PDB file of C-alpha atoms and ligand atoms in Angstrom:
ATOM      1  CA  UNK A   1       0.000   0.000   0.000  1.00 46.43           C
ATOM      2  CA  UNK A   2       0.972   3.679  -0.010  1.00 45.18           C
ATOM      3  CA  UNK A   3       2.031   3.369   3.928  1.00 40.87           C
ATOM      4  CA  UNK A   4       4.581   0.440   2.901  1.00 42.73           C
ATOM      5  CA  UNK A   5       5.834   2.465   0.291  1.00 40.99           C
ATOM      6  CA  UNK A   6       6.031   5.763   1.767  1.00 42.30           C
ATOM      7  CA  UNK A   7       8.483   4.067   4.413  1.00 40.54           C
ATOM      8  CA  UNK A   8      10.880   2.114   1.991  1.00 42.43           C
ATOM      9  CA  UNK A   9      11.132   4.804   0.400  1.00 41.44           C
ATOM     10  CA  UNK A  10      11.736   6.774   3.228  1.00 39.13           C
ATOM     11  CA  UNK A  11      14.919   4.117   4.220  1.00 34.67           C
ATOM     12  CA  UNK A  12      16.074   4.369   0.544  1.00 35.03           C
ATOM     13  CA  UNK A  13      16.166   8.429   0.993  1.00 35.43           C
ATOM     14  CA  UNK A  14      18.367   8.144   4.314  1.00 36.26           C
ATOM     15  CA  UNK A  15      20.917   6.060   2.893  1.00 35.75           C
ATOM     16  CA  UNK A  16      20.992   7.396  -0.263  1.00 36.69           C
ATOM     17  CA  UNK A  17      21.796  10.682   0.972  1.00 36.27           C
ATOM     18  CA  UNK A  18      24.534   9.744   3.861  1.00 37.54           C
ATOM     19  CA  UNK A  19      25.858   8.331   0.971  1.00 37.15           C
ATOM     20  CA  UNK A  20      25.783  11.325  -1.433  1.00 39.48           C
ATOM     21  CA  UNK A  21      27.259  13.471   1.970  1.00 37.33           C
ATOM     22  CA  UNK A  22      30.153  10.280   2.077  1.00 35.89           C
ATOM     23  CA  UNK A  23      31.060  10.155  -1.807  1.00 35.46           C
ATOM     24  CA  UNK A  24      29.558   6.607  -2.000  1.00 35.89           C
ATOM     25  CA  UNK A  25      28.961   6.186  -5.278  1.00 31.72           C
ATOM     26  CA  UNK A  26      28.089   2.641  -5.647  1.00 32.36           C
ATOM     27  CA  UNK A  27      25.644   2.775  -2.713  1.00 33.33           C
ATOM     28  CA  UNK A  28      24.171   6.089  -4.319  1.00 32.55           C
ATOM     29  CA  UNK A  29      24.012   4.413  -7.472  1.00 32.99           C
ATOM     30  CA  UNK A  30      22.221   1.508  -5.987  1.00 30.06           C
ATOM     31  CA  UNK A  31      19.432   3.100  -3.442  1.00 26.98           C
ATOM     32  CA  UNK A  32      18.494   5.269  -6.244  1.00 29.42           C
ATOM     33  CA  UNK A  33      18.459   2.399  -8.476  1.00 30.09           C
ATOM     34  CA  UNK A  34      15.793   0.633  -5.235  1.00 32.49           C
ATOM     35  CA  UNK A  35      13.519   4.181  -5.407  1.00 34.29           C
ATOM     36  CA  UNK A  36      13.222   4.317  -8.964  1.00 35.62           C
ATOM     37  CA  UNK A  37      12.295   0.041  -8.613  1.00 34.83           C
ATOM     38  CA  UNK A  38       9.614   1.283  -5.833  1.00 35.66           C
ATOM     39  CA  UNK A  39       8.283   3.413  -8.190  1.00 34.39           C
ATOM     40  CA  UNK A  40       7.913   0.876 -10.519  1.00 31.11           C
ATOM     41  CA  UNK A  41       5.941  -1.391  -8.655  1.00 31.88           C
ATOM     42  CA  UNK A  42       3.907   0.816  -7.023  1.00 29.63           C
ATOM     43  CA  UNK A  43       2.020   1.956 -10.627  1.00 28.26           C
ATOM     44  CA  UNK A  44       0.663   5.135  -9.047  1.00 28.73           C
ATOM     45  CA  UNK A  45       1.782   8.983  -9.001  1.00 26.61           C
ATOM     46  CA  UNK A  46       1.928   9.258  -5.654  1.00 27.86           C
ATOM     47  CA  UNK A  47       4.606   7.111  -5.759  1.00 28.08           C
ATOM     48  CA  UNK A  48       6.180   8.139  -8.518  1.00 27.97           C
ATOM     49  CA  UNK A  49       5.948  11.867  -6.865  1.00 26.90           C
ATOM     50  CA  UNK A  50       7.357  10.034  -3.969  1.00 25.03           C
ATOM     51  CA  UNK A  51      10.301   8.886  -5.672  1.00 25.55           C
ATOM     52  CA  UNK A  52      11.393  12.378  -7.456  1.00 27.10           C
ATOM     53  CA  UNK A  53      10.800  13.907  -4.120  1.00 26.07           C
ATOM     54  CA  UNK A  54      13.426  11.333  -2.988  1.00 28.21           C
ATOM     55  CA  UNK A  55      15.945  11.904  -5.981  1.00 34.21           C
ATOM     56  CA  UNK A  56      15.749  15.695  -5.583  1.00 32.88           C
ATOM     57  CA  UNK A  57      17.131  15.300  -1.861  1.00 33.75           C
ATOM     58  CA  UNK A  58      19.917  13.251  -2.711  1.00 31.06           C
ATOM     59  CA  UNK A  59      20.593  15.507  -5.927  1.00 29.04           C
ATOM     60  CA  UNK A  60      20.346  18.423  -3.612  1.00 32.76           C
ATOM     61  CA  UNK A  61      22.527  17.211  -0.835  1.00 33.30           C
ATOM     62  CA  UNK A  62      25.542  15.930  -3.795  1.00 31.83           C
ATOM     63  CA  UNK A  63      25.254  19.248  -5.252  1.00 30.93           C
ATOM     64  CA  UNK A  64      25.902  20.956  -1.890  1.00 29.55           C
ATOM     65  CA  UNK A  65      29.054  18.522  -1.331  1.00 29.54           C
ATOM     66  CA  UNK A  66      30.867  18.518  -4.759  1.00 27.89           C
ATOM     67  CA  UNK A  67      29.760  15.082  -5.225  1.00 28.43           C
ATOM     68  CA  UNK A  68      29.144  14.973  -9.714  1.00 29.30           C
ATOM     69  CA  UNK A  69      28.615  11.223  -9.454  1.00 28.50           C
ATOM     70  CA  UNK A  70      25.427  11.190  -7.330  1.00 28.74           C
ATOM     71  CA  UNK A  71      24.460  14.303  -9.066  1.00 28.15           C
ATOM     72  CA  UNK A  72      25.012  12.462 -12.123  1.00 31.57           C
ATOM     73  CA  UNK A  73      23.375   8.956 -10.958  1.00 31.01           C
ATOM     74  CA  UNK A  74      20.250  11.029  -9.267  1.00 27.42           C
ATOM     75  CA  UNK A  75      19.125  13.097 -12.405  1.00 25.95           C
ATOM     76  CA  UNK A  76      19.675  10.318 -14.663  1.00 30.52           C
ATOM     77  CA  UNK A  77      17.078   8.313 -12.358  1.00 27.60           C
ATOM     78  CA  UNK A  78      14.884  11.149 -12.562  1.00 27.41           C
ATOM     79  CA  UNK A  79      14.780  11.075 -16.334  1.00 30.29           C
ATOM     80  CA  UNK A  80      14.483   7.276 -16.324  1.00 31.68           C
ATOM     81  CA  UNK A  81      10.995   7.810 -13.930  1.00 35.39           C
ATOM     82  CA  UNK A  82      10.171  10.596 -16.323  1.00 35.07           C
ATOM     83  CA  UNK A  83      10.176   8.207 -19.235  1.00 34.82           C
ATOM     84  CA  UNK A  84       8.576   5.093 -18.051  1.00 34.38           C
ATOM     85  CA  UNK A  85       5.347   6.981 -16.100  1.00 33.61           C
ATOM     86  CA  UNK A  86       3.737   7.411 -18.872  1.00 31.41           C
ATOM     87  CA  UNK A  87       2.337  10.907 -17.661  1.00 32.23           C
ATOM     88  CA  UNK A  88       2.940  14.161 -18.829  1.00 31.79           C
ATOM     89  CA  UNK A  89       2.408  15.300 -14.214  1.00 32.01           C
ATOM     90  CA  UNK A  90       5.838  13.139 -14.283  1.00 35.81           C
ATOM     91  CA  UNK A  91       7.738  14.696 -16.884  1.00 36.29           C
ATOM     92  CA  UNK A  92       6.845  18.109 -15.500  1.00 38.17           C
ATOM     93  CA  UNK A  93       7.670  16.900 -11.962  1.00 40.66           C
ATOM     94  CA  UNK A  94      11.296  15.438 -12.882  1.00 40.65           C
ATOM     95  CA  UNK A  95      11.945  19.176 -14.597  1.00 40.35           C
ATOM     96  CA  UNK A  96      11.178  20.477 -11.750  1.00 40.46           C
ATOM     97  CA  UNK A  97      13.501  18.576  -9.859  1.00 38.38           C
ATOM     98  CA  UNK A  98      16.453  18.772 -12.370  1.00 38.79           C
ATOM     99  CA  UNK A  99      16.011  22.808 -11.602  1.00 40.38           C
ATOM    100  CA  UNK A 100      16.102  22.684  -7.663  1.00 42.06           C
ATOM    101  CA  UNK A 101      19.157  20.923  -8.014  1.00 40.96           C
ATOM    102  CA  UNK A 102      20.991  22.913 -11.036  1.00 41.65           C
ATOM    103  CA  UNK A 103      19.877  26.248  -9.082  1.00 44.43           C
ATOM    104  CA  UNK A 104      21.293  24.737  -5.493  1.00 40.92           C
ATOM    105  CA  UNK A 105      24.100  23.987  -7.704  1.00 41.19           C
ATOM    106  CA  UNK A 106      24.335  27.469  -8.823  1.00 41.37           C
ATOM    107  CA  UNK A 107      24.338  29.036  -5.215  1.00 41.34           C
ATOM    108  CA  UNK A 108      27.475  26.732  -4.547  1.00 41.03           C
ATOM    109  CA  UNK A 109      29.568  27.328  -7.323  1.00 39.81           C
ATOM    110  CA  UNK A 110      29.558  23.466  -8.415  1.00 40.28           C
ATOM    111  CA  UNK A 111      29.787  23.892 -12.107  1.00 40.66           C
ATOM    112  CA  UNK A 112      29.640  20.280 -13.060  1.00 39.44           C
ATOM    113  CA  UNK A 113      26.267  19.911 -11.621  1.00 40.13           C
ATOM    114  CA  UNK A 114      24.596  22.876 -13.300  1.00 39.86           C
ATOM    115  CA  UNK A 115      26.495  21.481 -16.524  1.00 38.68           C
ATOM    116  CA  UNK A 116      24.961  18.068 -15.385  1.00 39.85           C
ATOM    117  CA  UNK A 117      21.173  19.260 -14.514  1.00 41.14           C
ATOM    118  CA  UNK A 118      21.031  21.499 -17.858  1.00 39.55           C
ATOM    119  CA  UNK A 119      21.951  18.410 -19.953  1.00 42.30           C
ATOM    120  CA  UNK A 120      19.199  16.714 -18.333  1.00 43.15           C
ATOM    121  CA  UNK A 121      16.873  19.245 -18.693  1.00 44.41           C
ATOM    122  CA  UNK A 122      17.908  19.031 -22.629  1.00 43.96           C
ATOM    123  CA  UNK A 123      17.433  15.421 -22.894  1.00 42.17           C
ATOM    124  CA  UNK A 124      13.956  15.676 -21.607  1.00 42.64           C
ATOM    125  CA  UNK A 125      12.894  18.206 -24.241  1.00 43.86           C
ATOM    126  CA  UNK A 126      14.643  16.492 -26.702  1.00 49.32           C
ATOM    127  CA  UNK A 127      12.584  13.219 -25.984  1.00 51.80           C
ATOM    128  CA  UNK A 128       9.574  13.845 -24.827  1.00 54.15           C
ATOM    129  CA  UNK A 129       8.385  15.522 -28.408  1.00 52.93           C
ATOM    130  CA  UNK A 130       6.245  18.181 -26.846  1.00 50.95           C
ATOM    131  CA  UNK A 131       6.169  22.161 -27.141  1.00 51.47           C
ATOM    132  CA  UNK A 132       5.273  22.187 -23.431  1.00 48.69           C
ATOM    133  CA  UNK A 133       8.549  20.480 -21.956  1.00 49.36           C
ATOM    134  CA  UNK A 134      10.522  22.371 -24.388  1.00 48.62           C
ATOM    135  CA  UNK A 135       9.085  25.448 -23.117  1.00 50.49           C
ATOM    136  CA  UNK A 136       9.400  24.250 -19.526  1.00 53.56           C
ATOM    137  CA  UNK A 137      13.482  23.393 -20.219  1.00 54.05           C
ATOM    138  CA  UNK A 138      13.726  26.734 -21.677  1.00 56.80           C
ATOM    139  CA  UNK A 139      12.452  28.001 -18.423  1.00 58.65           C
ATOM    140  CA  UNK A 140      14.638  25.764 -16.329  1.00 57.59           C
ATOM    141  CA  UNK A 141      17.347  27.693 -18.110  1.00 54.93           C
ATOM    142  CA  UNK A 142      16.240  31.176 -17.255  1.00 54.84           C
ATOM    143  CA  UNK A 143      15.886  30.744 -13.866  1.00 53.39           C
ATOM    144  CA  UNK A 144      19.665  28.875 -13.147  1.00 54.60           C
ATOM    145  CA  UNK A 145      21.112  31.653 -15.585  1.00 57.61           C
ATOM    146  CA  UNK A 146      18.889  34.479 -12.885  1.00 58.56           C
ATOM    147  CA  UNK A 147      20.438  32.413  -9.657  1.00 59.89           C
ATOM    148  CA  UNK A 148      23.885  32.249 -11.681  1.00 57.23           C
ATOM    149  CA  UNK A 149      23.679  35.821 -12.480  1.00 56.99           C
ATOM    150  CA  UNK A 150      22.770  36.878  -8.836  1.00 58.88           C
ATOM    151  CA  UNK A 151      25.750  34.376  -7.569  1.00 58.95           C
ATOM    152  CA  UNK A 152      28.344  35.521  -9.589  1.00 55.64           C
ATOM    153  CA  UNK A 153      28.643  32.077 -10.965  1.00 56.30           C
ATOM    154  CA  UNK A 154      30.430  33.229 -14.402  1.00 55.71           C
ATOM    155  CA  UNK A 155      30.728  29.557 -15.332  1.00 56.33           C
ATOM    156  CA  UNK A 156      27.016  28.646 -14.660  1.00 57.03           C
ATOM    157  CA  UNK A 157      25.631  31.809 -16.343  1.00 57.01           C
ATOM    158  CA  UNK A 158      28.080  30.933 -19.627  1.00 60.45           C
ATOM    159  CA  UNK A 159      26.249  27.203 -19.459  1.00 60.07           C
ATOM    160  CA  UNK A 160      23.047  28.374 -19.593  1.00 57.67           C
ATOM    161  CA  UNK A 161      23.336  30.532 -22.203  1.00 56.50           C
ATOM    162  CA  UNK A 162      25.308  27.070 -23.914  1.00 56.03           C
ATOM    163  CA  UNK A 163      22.099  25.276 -23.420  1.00 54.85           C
ATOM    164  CA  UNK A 164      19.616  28.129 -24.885  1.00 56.66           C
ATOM    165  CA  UNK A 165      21.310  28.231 -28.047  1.00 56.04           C
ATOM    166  CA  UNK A 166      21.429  23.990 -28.368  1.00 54.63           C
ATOM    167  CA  UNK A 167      17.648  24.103 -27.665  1.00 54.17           C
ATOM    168  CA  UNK A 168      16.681  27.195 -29.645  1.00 51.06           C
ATOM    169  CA  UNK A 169      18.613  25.585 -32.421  1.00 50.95           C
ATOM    170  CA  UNK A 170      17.349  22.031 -32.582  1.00 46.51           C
ATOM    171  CA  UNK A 171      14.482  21.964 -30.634  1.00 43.19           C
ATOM    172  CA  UNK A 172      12.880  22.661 -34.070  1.00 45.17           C
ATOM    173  CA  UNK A 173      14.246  19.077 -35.267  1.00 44.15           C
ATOM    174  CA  UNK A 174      13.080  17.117 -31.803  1.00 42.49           C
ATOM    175  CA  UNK A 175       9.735  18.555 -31.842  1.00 41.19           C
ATOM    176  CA  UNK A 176       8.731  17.328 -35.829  1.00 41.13           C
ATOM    177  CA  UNK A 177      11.362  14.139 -35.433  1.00 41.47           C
TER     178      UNK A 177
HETATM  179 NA1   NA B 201       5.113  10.968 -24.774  1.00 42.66          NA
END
């Protein structure tokens, strides 16, 4: 049920992120791995929302440590929920969380994991076919280029700008392809 869920995922979140604090890939790689499996077999959007919710923390908590890997691992396991929901509410949500993390990112200086979280946020518009999540990624970018702006994160500002021009460039092929 949603109770049993709620708590494994709950364990999953715990050790996933004393693990992202630690630099523990392989058990980063693996609890993430267990949450996007819970959402699997749970076959509802609470759980799914569940399991993003989860992936953000641990994407947010790498991102504050310097830790690309579980950056890396965490938004790739986003876009892997994102593609096997089904549900446009999923898609949307796993944006979402791809921009908490590249704008945390942002505030900290950690260039690899705004670099990491944009490319994400690319490969979502690129696949998912739709105006909308183009649109969305294109807002994703404006708001880490603001925080990178206010930050004085030179590097992160230059990456979003990177980013832009790739989607306003070929999002014309993605959307008809
Ligand atoms: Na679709």
């Amino acid at each position: 049920t949603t109770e049993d869920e709620r708590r494994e995922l709950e364990k999953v979140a715990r050790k996933a992120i004393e693990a992202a604090r630690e630099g523990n890939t392989d058990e980063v790689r693996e609890q993430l791995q267990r949450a996007l499996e819970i959402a699997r077999e749970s076959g509802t959007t609470e759980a799914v929302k569940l399991a993003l919710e989860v992936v953000a923390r641990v994407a947010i908590e790498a991102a504050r440590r310097g830790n690309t890997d579980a950056v890396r691992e965490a938004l790739e396991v986003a876009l892997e929920i994102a593609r096997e929901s089904g549900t446009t509410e999923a898609v949307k949500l796993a944006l979402e969380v791809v921009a908490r993390v590249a704008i945390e990112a942002a505030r900290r200086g950690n260039t690899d994991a705004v670099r990491e979280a944009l490319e994400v946020a690319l490969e979502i518009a690129r696949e998912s076919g739709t105006e909308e999540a183009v649109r969305l990624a294109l807002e994703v970018v404006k708001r880490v280029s603001d925080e990178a702006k206010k930050q004085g994160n030179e590097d992160a500002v230059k990456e979003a700008e990177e980013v832009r021009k790739k989607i306003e460039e070929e999002s014309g092929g993605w959307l008809e392809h």
